[PDB]
Amino acid sequence: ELPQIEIVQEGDNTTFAKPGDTVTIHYDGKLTNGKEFDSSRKRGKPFTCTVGVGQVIKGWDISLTNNYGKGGPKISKGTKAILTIPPNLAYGPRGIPPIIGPNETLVFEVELLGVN
């Protein structure tokens, strides 16, 4: 099981995130019906994390590190993308209430602003 990645605009094609790197991202998250559940851009602080270590949902690790080198679409710095993430790679049947319901598929519109 993998997440679906659709490249909206591309970046440098050179700077790809690898496991253990940090990234900086502006994301809007919404459900398949379009209802938005969060946006970093509205909060004014870009999200920063360490990818590939399980410090985020599995869909983000797989998307940002190219499934740790075993694809089946890479994301470079400056790429604006859309990640469609199935519930098993997100918040499963439990969900994060009240912000994410059960068995929900998540669609993140991410812009990779920086790596390291």
Partner: protein, 361 residues
């Protein structure tokens, strides 16, 4: 530990003012109190807020579908619960004690202070019913408030009963206005079914907006993107962007204005970097055929757009712009910090409790 770690931050006002503060002795809401109280994120007792909803519904339900608004008047576009920009708007537009107002709808959704915007605007309406007017926008209905933020807001801050009472007040909002016998004012725009002004006068409006038809179009219509180019012969085209209703052309506006003997159409509904936008001028009299107002600066905390209101008098359109003002922070979905952090607490603690457990084969 018991003191506040960030003392430069003002704390919220009380969630329970006394009746004698929220209402004047005559029983009308004390809008000067509510203005300051909402600036400091105070809340009302639910029964007080329902009382304000019920008095506004009573006044609104007696007004006609199509208001008559005399000049001079300040006309305002969308607010979307941006209460701290609404404070600035009144500074720019004039004191409601001596300034006529016409709002074009979209009071709620997206900003985290929709119920403050709505209760405050209604308390002005109640105290100034002959000089203060509010149209319905497309967000003042059940479908959109369910889909966006306003229902989650009422349920968090108050209850579903209050949410239902707001819906009753939305269904009572007038649809449009003739301003100074010169302008058609509406939230969205024109309609293929807007044959005469009577078509609008005959509507039964106390309802959720229909999927299609006149009432939907007034709330949902846009001009076509190429409106100024004036290169379409049709009047109306399917509004794919909105996914309902129509986009209308320069030709539709001009034929409508000629029919109804009006100068221009003033509407809102679309964000404007400059706060307003004047479209192609009328071949009949030279006024703008269309004007879009938008009163929500730095829309959604990300657009960095200016806002504008329209101060109309002496056949003059004084456009007054303003920038965004700071506002307090709310988590998405109005979560408290326990709802927000407890899933992560459990993950982080458990992880340690499993490492401690797995130390032995």
């Amino acid at each position: 530990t018991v003191e506040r770690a960030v003392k430069s931050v003002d704390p919220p006002a009380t969630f329970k003012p006394k009746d004698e503060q929220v209402f004047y002795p005559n029983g009308k809401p004390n809008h000067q109190f509510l203005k300051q109280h909402f600036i400091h994120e105070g809340r009302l007792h639910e029964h007080q807020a329902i009382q304000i909803l019920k008095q506004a519904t009573h006044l609104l339900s007696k007004e006609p579908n199509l208001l008559s608004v005399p000049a001079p008047v300040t006309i305002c576009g969308d607010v979307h619960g941006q209460y701290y920009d609404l404070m600035k708007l009144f500074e720019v537009g004039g004191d409601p004690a001596s300034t006529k107002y016409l709002f074009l709808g979209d009071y709620v959704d997206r900003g985290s202070f929709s119920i403050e915007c709505l209760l405050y605007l209604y308390s002005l309406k109640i105290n100034y019913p002959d000089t203060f007017w509010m149209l319905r926008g497309n967000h003042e209905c059940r479908h959109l408030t369910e889909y966006f933020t306003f229902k989650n807001e009422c349920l968090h801050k108050y209850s579903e009963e209050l949410y239902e009472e707001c819906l009753v007040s939305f269904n009572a909002l007038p649809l449009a206005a003739i301003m100074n016998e010169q302008f058609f004012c509406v939230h969205g725009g024109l309609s293929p079914q807007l044959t005469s002004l009577d078509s609008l006068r005959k509507l039964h409006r106390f309802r959720e907006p229909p999927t299609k038809g006149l009432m939907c179009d007034l709330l949902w219509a846009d001009p076509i993107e190429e409106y100024d180019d004036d290169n379409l012969d049709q009047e109306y085209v399917t509004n794919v962007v909105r996914g309902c209703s129509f986009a209308f052309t320069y030709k539709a506006a001009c034929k409508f204005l000629d029919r109804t003997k009006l100068l221009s159409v003033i509407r809102a509904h679309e964000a404007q970097n400059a706060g307003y936008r004047m479209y192609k001028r009328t071949k009949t009299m030279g006024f703008p055929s269309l004007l879009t107002m938008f009163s929500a600066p730095n829309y959604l905390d990300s657009y960095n757009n200016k806002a504008a209101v329209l101060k109309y008098e002496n056949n003059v359109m004084n456009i007054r712009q303003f920038n965004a003002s700071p506002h307090p922070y709310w988590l998405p979905h109005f979560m408290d910090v326990f709802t927000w952090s407890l899933p992560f607490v459990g993950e982080k603690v458990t992880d340690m409790l499993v490492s401690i457990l797995n130390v032995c084969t």
